[PDB]
A paper describes a structure:
The RlmJ structure was solved in space group P21 with two monomers in the asymmetric unit related by a 2-fold non-crystallographic symmetry. The structure suggests that RlmJ functions as a monomer, consistent with its behavior in size exclusion chromatography. The final models consist of residues 2–280, but with residues 53–55 missing in the second molecule. The location of the inserted subdomain is novel among AdoMet-dependent MTases. Comparison of the structures shows that one molecule in the RlmJSAM structure has the same conformation as the RlmJAPO structure, whereas the other molecule takes the conformation of the RlmJSAH-AMP structure [root mean square deviation (RMSD) of 0.2 Å over 280 Cα atoms for the respective comparison]. In the open form, motif X does not approach the active site, and instead is stabilized by interactions with strand β2 (R47 and Q49) and helix α5 (residues D123–E130).
The RlmJ structure consists of a discontinuous MTase domain (residues 1–46 and 99–280), interrupted by a helical subdomain (HS, residues 47–98). The structure of RlmJ is the first one of an enzyme with demonstrated monomethylating m6A RNA MTase activity. There was no detectable MTase activity on any of the mutant RNAs or the single-stranded DNA. These data show RlmJ is highly specific to adenosine at position 2030, requiring only a small hairpin for activity.
Residue numbers in the entry: 2 to 280
Write the structure that this text describes.
Amino acid sequence: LSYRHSFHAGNHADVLKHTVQSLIIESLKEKDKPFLYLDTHAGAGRYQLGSEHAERTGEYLEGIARIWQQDDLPAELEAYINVVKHFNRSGQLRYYPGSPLIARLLLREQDSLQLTELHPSDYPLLRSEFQKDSRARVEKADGFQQLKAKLPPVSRRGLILIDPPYEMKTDYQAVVSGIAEGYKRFATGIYALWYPVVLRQQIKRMIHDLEATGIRKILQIELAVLPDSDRRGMTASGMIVINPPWKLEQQMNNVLPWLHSKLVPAGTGHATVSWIVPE
């Protein structure tokens, strides 16, 4: 099968999501003991950029394109950008890695991957990406159900990355319920949830519901390319991290101003790091 095309891959949201994922993975690697990378909605593995037609078009033009060849790239972005460069060795943007391939190139020999994807184009492509990589288990199954089935890991260490559908009200609720079930089984796991800002009120409710679980130690990192609106698509996105590694808050405070300056040259929107639930 041919690699999956995507119009959104490598956009400002992916830049934020993958900056955070890489920093968490690098922290987990500071202990020589094994850990698990669990991706509930793993997608195809990699995406072709630029569209199937002759013109080079896609949101990557306002995302990864604006940072990957900067000479003053912050040190916190090196691990991530080096993965992107690996899939684009000619020096032209043609492919963008999904979270599973970020994980594949950053994890060590002793670490494990557990990946789920239901889509009939994406799943077979994902399986092909991990042929003969025995560290990975790739299944065509419901993502949220893995938080019950696969936690806690035998290693008792891990990053759980949740990058779910947000198409209806029940989608936003499924996120909080799933996290609660995982946390019940694996309270010391690091949970990283990506969310879009299309309607702020849905996000407010989601965060309210998350606070209500009683879960502590919840960090929020958000980057907005525009001010909230009712009449745009996605104006912003963020990462909510439960049990963030010791350095993450500091690392993000260090890189967000640079990231926002490069991703949003007009200076609109905002970039924030704060705690939803302290402690």
